[PDB]
Amino acid sequence: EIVLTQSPGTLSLSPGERATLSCRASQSVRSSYLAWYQQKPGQAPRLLIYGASSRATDIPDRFSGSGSGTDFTLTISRLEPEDFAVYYCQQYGTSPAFGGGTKV
Amino acid sequence: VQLLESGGALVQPGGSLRLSCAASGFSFSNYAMSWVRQAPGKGLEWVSTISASGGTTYFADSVKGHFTISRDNSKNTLYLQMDSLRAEDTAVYYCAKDPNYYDLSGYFLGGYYFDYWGQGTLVTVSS
Amino acid sequence: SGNWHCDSQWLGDRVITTSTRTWALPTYNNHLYKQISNSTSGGSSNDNAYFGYSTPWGYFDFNRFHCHFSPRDWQRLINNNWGFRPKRLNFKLFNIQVLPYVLGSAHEGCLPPFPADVFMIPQYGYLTLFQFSYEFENVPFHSSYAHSQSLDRLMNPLIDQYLYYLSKTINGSGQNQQTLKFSVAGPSNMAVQGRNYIPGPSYRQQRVSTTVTQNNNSEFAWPGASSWALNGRNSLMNPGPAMASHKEGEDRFFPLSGSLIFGKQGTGRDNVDADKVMITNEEEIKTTNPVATESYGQVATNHQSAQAQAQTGWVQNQGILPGMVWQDRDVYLQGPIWAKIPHTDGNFHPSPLMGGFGMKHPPPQILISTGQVSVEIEWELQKENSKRWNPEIQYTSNYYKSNNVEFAVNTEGVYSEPRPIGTRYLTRNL
Amino acid sequence: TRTWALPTYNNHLYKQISNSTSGGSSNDNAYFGYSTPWGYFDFNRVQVFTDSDYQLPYVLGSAHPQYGYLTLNDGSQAVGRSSFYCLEYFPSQMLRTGNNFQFSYEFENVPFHSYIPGPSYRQQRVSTTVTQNNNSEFAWPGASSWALNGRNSLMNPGPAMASLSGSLIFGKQGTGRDNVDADKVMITNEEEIKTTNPVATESYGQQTGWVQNQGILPGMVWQDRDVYLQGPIWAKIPHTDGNFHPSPLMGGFGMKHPPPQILIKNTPVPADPPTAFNKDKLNSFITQYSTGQVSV
Amino acid sequence: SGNWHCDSQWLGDRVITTSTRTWALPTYNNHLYKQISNSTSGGSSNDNAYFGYSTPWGYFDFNRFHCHFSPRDWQRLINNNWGFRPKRLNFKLFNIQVLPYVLGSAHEGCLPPFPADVFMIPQYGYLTLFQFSYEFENVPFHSSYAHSQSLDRLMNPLIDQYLYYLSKTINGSGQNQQTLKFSVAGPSNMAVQGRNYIPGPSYRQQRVSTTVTQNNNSEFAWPGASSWALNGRNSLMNPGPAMASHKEGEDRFFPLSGSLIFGKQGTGRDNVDADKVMITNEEEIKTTNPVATESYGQVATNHQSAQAQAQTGWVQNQGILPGMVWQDRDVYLQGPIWAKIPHTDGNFHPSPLMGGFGMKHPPPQILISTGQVSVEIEWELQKENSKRWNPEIQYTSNYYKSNNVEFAVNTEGVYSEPRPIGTRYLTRNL
Amino acid sequence: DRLMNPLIDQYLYYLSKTINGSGQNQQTLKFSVAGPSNMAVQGRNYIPGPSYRQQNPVATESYGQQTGWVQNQGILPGMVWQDR
Amino acid sequence: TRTWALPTYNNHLYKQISNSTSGGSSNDNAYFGYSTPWGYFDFNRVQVFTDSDYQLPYVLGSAHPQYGYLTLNDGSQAVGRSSFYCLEYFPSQMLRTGNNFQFSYEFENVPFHSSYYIPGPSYRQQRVSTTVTQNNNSEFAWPGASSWALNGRNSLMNPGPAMASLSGSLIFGKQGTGRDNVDADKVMITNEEEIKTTNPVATESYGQQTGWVQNQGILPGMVWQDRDVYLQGPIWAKIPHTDGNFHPSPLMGGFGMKHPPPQILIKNTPVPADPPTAFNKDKLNSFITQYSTGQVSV
Amino acid sequence: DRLMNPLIDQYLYYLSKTINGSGQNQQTLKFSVAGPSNMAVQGRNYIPGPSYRQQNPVATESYGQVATNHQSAQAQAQTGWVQNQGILPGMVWQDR
């Protein structure tokens, strides 16, 4: 199969700061599409990115990601109180799979 | 788009139940549909996907043989039946939607990111 | 020296389509005739060996359908009609500001789908071993309908046949149980009934799963493809005889070469992913045609006897037999219109294999700075008389909100065609 | 000229039918369709209208009364393309006991019924001496077939070849319906045609290999299948982009516009309706059937 | 004495539909006339108070649409045309075997939609304090299209207006900051621009959601419903003025009394669940008509002064103003065709509220064992001329497999219509 | 408003019931056939003319109707009225 | 007669414009639409075609150059009912330097504009005084405004029903007036007071335990006068195509017409630059810069 | 089979590449334009005529190949030689 591993574990946010995060996937045969999800607790999740470099419909320009091959990243700026949460990278090239998640 | 889940109830191990996702706000026959589980101690995990016409259904190895997914286009509802449940199956099961539109012109390329998320029903297997 | 004519006119059983575009013709080969060959490009393989010439001339190409039909006019055509075909052609070249027939090989360089787009005239060439009017020769109506009945189910379900078939060859378990029993063919068993017509021809294809993990872990693109060898070179069979792309209710599989594959807007020339290119499946023809990826049937391979069992082998490719019916391949908004029939002693069912109207005298080549071009084709229509009670399947644009309306420009001004569109929506009896 | 007895069918009602309503069958045997209250006149071996536009499904070329039609299926289920035809929805002439009905029909031009040999699809050989047969069940397993949309269907009678499934078999008078021995049925043989046609059970031709089936080749001449006193006369040609040698494989004359269907039913006359208005349809009818004279 | 006619002819700009049904006429009230009122049935409320007679006479009512159209003929109509209206009428009654105008009230007892059904005649009745032909008086075409623009977006997005609006009434935070500031109405702010025309009238309804948990936990069916009072009797407002059913994106909400609701085949009389009925929406007219559950707008309720702020109030019901434009209510396959305009000294826009054609002289009542009815209406069509580039939304059957075919009969021979079908698919510019 | 046929049912439904009974979380939608038994809730094609209250509709009665009363009504499409 | 200067717009490209393109951020002002390379002539105060079937969106009635139109939207997105019109898909006339173009139009019959039982309708407005101190010291421009809601969006009621003198008047600029936040002496505020006899005052109640009538629809017995026309004001309008309307005369004044004078659409035919000489599939994005000028007499 | 214009690309695609190679579990589908670089794989409207093997296609050559099975994870795509081929719609042939 394909194993996905979130590189950063965690950090906590006070508003105004910004940081980036990534995940590495074993084999990483197809890199065109990967998706990033952000989950608020106690309620259904919501989408962020769709495709290696394409931002979502209701998501602010400051959300971004890039990658190809095994390594992929999620690069976000102007990062505000609502954004301290878990980040999920999905590799759907094969049957869908998630990384463990990175809670920033 | 409104996805609604029914049939999530406590079930003792070795006992089955049938979840149903009643959907509206989209065509629903032209889009593939997936189930994705979240165990309270863990994050999101994908279970199975069914195509818009129902021709193709694939599963995760974790759920293989206990689970089956079917859909009824006429009734606009998505079914997931869980048989011979174990204790490791307890979670909120979310009904998720595929972005890609499906016609008899064209094929099913597979699963993609999950567009929209219903309010997941919560199944607990414990005795 | 000319005006701007773009529209469509729907009158009775005919359609008048008018397309006017802007062209730009560079000087090619710098006013010379150059020789080109595989060796000039390196000639890596035997099958790709070629020889011929390249000429300075350009040509106007309007073979594809979307040139002549707006996406609305195409919908208006396919939902309301059981057939269509061209009648008369009119060409005008104006506002100028300074042979081998290659039009039928599905080449690029035709007028842009969108009238505000300006295009570059292609370079003419061939291989070896102002206004005018045109008249289309008589061709059969393209069949833009899908059969509502299948070839094997034409029977009346309520009544037995008077024919008899052989139901049982033995009494039971033991030695010397041989017997011959004859049941009558009846609705309880419809497989065994005698039939007047049999499904069309087949030349088998290899099925590729769109889910890649189910496919074999090897390179089978060429080694496992269907092919036909001409004069020692093996040519790929593409798209091939018209056959259903998949069985009823199978969306995942497609025949390897057995389809026409269109690229989406902005798609790269080499090694693009499956999402990038639009594959077309001819599944509307399953009712009368064998599936491209399945065998035609079985045949007995021997004479049974006391010590020998009846044996059957598989029939991979089947020719023509008396009593066959079939459907031709469908035509698309992005597909070719006509193809010139190769001049030969004889041919069978000359209709071309990529779709469209085969013609022995197709529209001639126009050989030829910037200017304008206005092409006008007259199309004849065939209305539906169907008595069907329940509503048909229609081509519809999805109502749900999206970032960009389909078949239109984006924010950056690029016209796109989001999906391949077939002509078969309305239905008929078989 | 005959005299017909036509009853009421389905109590003036259209019934969706499927293999599941018939017990479920198997994959090759699956079907979906509708059965109609209307009857029909089949000589191919009160309300009435003929379908001259061929707008209804044509059942008369199946070598088979009640009329019903089959449509597309995935199984015991119907797909979107499947169509439903209401026979009430044509104009029809309603004849009382003294009224007459007649129509004339002009046949379209067709050939009079009569280099390497013609095409072949091999058949298994069966001996009328049961001791020469093999001691196993080879009826279906050893039978030549063709598959359409994933369903197998026996090749019957198939391309014309000179004498298993490749011959017409007629029943003797009062023949039993099921599992009847050979002397109960009349098994025809085509061997008249062995001049221009290959032996049905023999290979077509030919290290080397045996060629079991051969499609059309330029330079073939062949004879069509024989016609019989019991056999069919004509068969409709399926409306399609292409066909080859449209003559039907059971024999007779293939026609793009064959003789039309003639549909007949007893006009429903309701029984005594209730004395207060009920919007539901009336299911209470007077038991009835009709009779008359047929001439062609 | 007659024949059976059940086919339709689509000829040019006209449609000729001919239906024929089998009927049964009993004797009502045993050949008697009888006074009837509520005092017989107990008449608990003055709202239900009625007085009238019941006659042994029957009548034939073909008024609903699905009498004259098949599901395919209805599709063929609504996809291809911007308008229609009836022209002539033909009624025939044959094969016999042994005043107050009530036809405009959407009663049951009309000829069945499926030609193989035998229908029973409704008994004639009224309240108070063989063949013939007919000529429909001239009515405006029904508008079977949905606007491709909205009333407030008619403007050119690229250009400023030459009108000014008052942007600022003060400079900023502080005492004595009053000012008058004027800005150019332009693309950046479209809300404040001046416009020539305003949306149609609104008479407010109450909003109910198909999701029961979002509704209030109290009984408001009759209490919370809009109504109009006449001489001490409160009539529910049904369906009421034509207004959009819901705002864009909210499909679970519908006006309480504001929509036309149909039963599914086999649905009981009283207190059926929401899955048994087919609620209808007027979302097509949202562009020029106010949402039924929203206020029309706001007004000034006072004078502002140094001591008085600007106060506003909501307009729940707005009548006609000069300049308004509105769409009438859509017609459905199951809905009524015509009504009779009440004879009065004056009326405004007589088009009936349940949809269809208002007529001062509608098709006359037919007052009348068993037999045959054959009714024939002629229809006039208004063709679609639009230049729209991208494809339309069309009414379509569903591609997927199912147990039963929609608009057909099941295994027991019951005929049903799965959903209501409107006439508005094609579009026009506002 | 009485123009209906008293003997026949409409094919139109009205919402008759928003709750099963007394209790908590009892919400429901029940629909019934509007017909002779209840003539107030039936669908109608025409409504009375406009009214501006004095201290056809009645002069001292409100035109119609949480809800609130209509103390004046302008013209609406579908109205009929008698002159003076 | 004038002399026109027509530039080349949007690189000869049709382009989707929407709410998010302009920065969005507001739902009431959200829109979705297109901008065209074609220009047009507006007197309501090289290729050419007029729309005599009225098949294009009609922008000449908004009291406003480059031609653009708006279609249906949800948010800034596009519902399937949204239309896209390519103006290249009309037949048009192509004029070289010596060529000319003209057409004649016949106005459909309208009554003469008047220039001179109970009073007519009213929809009340807020009263604003030109003296700043007389007005309340608070931001009441949008909060105190008269609006009508359509599909959840609140548009100002402007100018509104015809009444005698906030938003109920036409406001014109004085020569050299800024585009943003200009003072009160830089704008001309018209008055309709000529009609004050037959019509109610815009800022007043229509009439009347009693209670106030802040808006009154039409009644039998109402007489009213429409809005006067101005030398700087509009002439006509296009009556929207609908099942019904009342008193089609437009609210900004002038002559309402269901088939008003046709739009006149014009553009400069593109001339491509040097082609690459090696055949390419792509469309040509390289255009020789060009612009035109000429004469127009209406 | 050479009737094409050698200077231009088709707008049609073929499946060039099924696996990345030199590894386990490498599987993909890559599509390339059909063009002058590889002319064996282009879609053609007409195919050569019939053949009956001897000891228009060459008389001593097999007409072509077909797929004789369904490939899968455990099954390699198999072919078979067509020794004789009857008429197919679209064939052209020269007589003797």
Torsion angle defined by CA atoms of residues C300, C303, C307 and C311, in that order, rounded to the nearest 10 degrees: -10
Structural domain ending residue among the three candidates C329, C346, C373: C329
List residues bridging with A55 in a β-sheet.
A49
* Residues B21 and A44: beta-carbon distance below 8 Å: no
Question: Is the same domain home to C119 and C149?
Answer: no
- Angle value at C-alpha E126, between E121 and E132, nearest 5 degrees: 50
Contacts of A65 (CB under 8 A, 6+ apart): A34, A36, A49, A52, A53, A72, A73, A74, A75
- Are C251 and B108 a contacting pair at CB < 8 A? yes
Residue E143: is it exposed, middle or buried by C-beta count within 10 angstroms (0-12/13-18/19+)? buried
Structural domain ending residue among the three candidates C295, C329, C363: C329
C357: its two tokens: 């109207």
Residue of chain G whose alpha carbon sits nearest to that of H11: G281
- Are C22 and G269 a contacting pair at CB < 8 A? yes
Q: How far is residue C95 CA from its own chain's centroid?
A: 37
DSSP state of C152: G
* Residues C285 and D72: beta-carbon distance below 8 Å: no
Question: Is the same domain home to H5 and H40?
Answer: yes
Helix (H) or strand (E) holding E277: strand E277-279
E41 C-beta neighbours (distance < 10 Å), count: 12
Overall number of domains in chain C? 2
* Residues C251 and B102: beta-carbon distance below 8 Å: yes
C187: its two tokens: 């609705």
* Residues D94 and E3: beta-carbon distance below 8 Å: yes
Residue D132: is it exposed, middle or buried by C-beta count within 10 angstroms (0-12/13-18/19+)? middle
Q: How determined?
A: cryo-EM
Domain housing H6 = 1-46
Question: Is the same domain home to C321 and C370?
Answer: no
C-alpha distances (whole Å) from G280 to each of B50, C120, C121, C374, E282 are 42, 7, 9, 22, 50
Strands B17-24 and B77-82: antiparallel
Question: Is residue D87 in some structural domain?
Answer: yes
DSSP labels for E312-341? EEEESEE---TTEEE-----BTTSB-EEEP
**Of F49, G101, D71, nearest in space to E348 by CA:** F49
Question: Is the same domain home to G273 and G293?
Answer: yes
Each as own residue / partner, the long-range contacts of residues B22-27 (CB below 8 Å, 24 or more positions apart, any chain) are B22/B76, B22/B77, B22/B78, B23/B76, B23/B77, B23/B78, B23/B95, B23/B97, B23/B118, B24/B76, B24/E251, B24/E252, B25/B1, B25/E251, B26/B1, B26/B97, B26/C400, B27/B101, B27/C398, B27/C400
**Of E193, E366, E211, nearest in space to E274 by CA:** E211
**Of B47, E213, B19, B119, nearest in space to A42 by CA:** B119
Residue E115: is it exposed, middle or buried by C-beta count within 10 angstroms (0-12/13-18/19+)? buried
> A58-81: buried (b, 16+ CB within 10 Å) or exposed (e) per residue?
ebeeebbbebeeeebbbebeebee
**Of D19, D45, D37, nearest in space to D230 by CA:** D45
Question: Is residue C180 in some structural domain?
Answer: no
Residue D280: is it exposed, middle or buried by C-beta count within 10 angstroms (0-12/13-18/19+)? exposed
Phi and psi of D67, rounded to 5°? -95, 135
A47, A96, A101: residue with CB nearest B111: A96
Edge-to-edge strand ranges of the sheet holding E324-326 = E198-199, E324-326, G244-245
- Which regions of A11-70 does DSSP assign to beta strands (E)? 21-25, 35-39, 46-47, 65-67
Residue A42: is it exposed, middle or buried by C-beta count within 10 angstroms (0-12/13-18/19+)? exposed
Instruction: Determine the residue type at C262.
Output: F
- Are C399 and G86 a contacting pair at CB < 8 A? no
C-alpha distances (whole Å) from C289 to each of C31, C198, H46 are 50, 9, 19
**Of G220, G54, G245, nearest in space to E328 by CA:** G245
Helix (H) or strand (E) holding C75: helix C71-80
C-alpha distances (whole Å) from G69 to each of B14, C71, D228, E265, E388 are 63, 20, 74, 46, 13
DSSP state of C364: P
* Residues E12 and C11: beta-carbon distance below 8 Å: no
C-alpha distances (whole Å) from E148 to each of E332, G19, G27, H93 are 21, 18, 19, 55
Chain B contacts to E (CB-CB under 8 A): 2, 24-25, 29, 53-54, 73-74, 103-104
- Are D119 and H86 a contacting pair at CB < 8 A? yes
Helix (H) or strand (E) holding E65: helix E65-68
3-state secondary structure of E52: strand
What gap in Å lies between CA E43 and CA F38, rounded to an integer? Answer: 9
Peptide-bond breaks in chain C following residues (C–N over 2.5 A): 98, 129, 368
**Four-residue CA torsion sign, D140, D143, D148, D150:** positive
Contacts of E174 (CB under 8 A, 6+ apart): none
Question: Is residue C249 in some structural domain?
Answer: yes
**Of D262, D263, D265, D267, nearest in space to D296 by CA:** D262
C-alpha distances (whole Å) from D125 to each of A34, C309, D138, D155, E263 are 61, 11, 11, 14, 62
- Which regions of chain D does DSSP assign to beta strands (E)? 2-7, 15-18, 32-40, 47-51, 66-71, 93-94, 120-121, 145-148, 151-154, 169-171, 185-187, 213-214, 234-236, 242-244, 253-255, 261-265, 289-294
Question: Is the same domain home to F12 and F31?
Answer: yes
Each as own residue / partner, the long-range contacts of residues D126-131 (CB below 8 Å, 24 or more positions apart, any chain) are D126/C166, D126/C180, D126/C304, D126/D164, D128/C180, D128/D182, D130/C178, D130/C179, D130/C180, D131/C176, D131/C178, D131/C306
DSSP labels for C305-350? -SS----EEEE-EE---TTEEE-PPP--TTSB-EEEPPP-SEESS-
What gap in Å lies between CA C16 and CA C8, rounded to an integer? Answer: 6
> D6-36: buried (b, 16+ CB within 10 Å) or exposed (e) per residue?
bebbbebbbbbbbbbeeeebeebbbbbbbbb
Outline where D16-129 has alpha helix (H).
Answer: none
What gap in Å lies between CA C100 and CA C110, rounded to an integer? Answer: 18
Question: Is the same domain home to C286 and C380?
Answer: no
Among C251, C252, C404, the residue to mutate for chain B (most B Cβ within 10 A): C251
* Residues E79 and C394: beta-carbon distance below 8 Å: yes
Chain G hits for E349, Cβ within 8 Å:
244
* Residues C387 and D56: beta-carbon distance below 8 Å: yes
* Residues B1 and B113: beta-carbon distance below 8 Å: no
C-alpha distances (whole Å) from C107 to each of C62, C102, D107, E72, H9 are 10, 8, 47, 40, 6
**Of F41, G29, F78, nearest in space to E243 by CA:** F78
Length of chain E: 430
Question: Is the same domain home to H61 and H33?
Answer: no
Helix (H) or strand (E) holding E357: strand E357-359
Q: With left for phi above 0 and alpha for psi between -120 and 50, is residue C385 left, alpha or beta? A: alpha
Torsion angle defined by CA atoms of residues E98, E102, E105 and E106, in that order, rounded to the nearest 10 degrees: 10
C-alpha distances (whole Å) from E128 to each of E28, E32, G240 are 20, 19, 42
**Of G282, G297, G122, G133, nearest in space to G218 by CA:** G122
What gap in Å lies between CA G20 and CA G75, rounded to an integer? Answer: 9
* Residues E326 and E200: beta-carbon distance below 8 Å: yes
Strands E427-428 and E146-147: parallel
Question: Is the same domain home to E76 and E104?
Answer: yes
Helix (H) or strand (E) holding C89: strand C81-97
C-alpha distances (whole Å) from C324 to each of B67, B116, C321, C424, D158 are 45, 49, 6, 21, 10
B46: its two tokens: 């994908």
Question: Is the same domain home to H42 and H54?
Answer: no
Question: Is the same domain home to H6 and H39?
Answer: yes
Chain E hits for D88, Cβ within 8 Å:
4, 6, 114-116
* Residues G42 and G234: beta-carbon distance below 8 Å: no
C291: its two tokens: 């599936």
Chain D nearest C-alpha distance from E404 (Å): 6
What gap in Å lies between CA G149 and CA E299, rounded to an integer? Answer: 12
* Residues H15 and C221: beta-carbon distance below 8 Å: yes
Look-up of token digits 């807007």: C265
* Residues D155 and D213: beta-carbon distance below 8 Å: no
Question: Is residue D214 in some structural domain?
Answer: yes
3-state secondary structure of H81: strand
What gap in Å lies between CA E53 and CA C255, rounded to an integer? Answer: 73
What gap in Å lies between CA E202 and CA E294, rounded to an integer? Answer: 9
What gap in Å lies between CA E364 and CA E134, rounded to an integer? Answer: 8
F72, F76, F83: residue with CB nearest G216: F72
- Are F64 and E229 a contacting pair at CB < 8 A? yes
CATH classification code of B2-122: 2.60.40.10
What gap in Å lies between CA H20 and CA H1, rounded to an integer? Answer: 31
Domains of chain A: 1-104 (2.60.40.10)
Which residues in chain E (250-269) have CB-CB distances under 8 A to chain B? 251-252
* Residues E95 and E372: beta-carbon distance below 8 Å: yes
* Residues D242 and C351: beta-carbon distance below 8 Å: yes
3-state secondary structure of E214: helix
DSSP state of E138: P
Question: Is the same domain home to F2 and F37?
Answer: yes
E339: its two tokens: 């009504």
DSSP state of G168: S
Among C13, C117, C395, C396, the residue to mutate for chain E (most E Cβ within 10 A): C396
Phi and psi of C72, rounded to 5°? -75, -45
- Angle value at C-alpha G228, between G223 and G232, nearest 5 degrees: 165
Residue of chain C whose alpha carbon sits nearest to that of A57: C403
* Residues E230 and E237: beta-carbon distance below 8 Å: no
- Are C213 and A95 a contacting pair at CB < 8 A? yes
Which residues in chain D (237-276) have CB-CB distances under 8 A to chain H? 242
Look-up of token digits 């016949």: G106
**Four-residue CA torsion sign, G51, G55, G57, G60:** positive
Contacts of G135 (CB under 8 A, 6+ apart): E169, E178, E304, E305, E306, G128, G129
Question: Is residue E2 in some structural domain?
Answer: no
What gap in Å lies between CA C218 and CA A30, rounded to an integer? Answer: 17
C-alpha distances (whole Å) from E357 to each of C334, E143, E338 are 44, 11, 5
Chain E hits for G90, Cβ within 8 Å:
387
List residues bridging with E88 in a β-sheet.
E135
What gap in Å lies between CA H92 and CA H85, rounded to an integer? Answer: 13
Question: Is residue H91 in some structural domain?
Answer: no
Question: Is residue H61 in some structural domain?
Answer: yes
> E256-266: buried (b, 16+ CB within 10 Å) or exposed (e) per residue?
bbbbbbbbeee
Question: Is the same domain home to D6 and D100?
Answer: yes
* Residues E403 and D17: beta-carbon distance below 8 Å: no
* Residues D41 and C117: beta-carbon distance below 8 Å: no
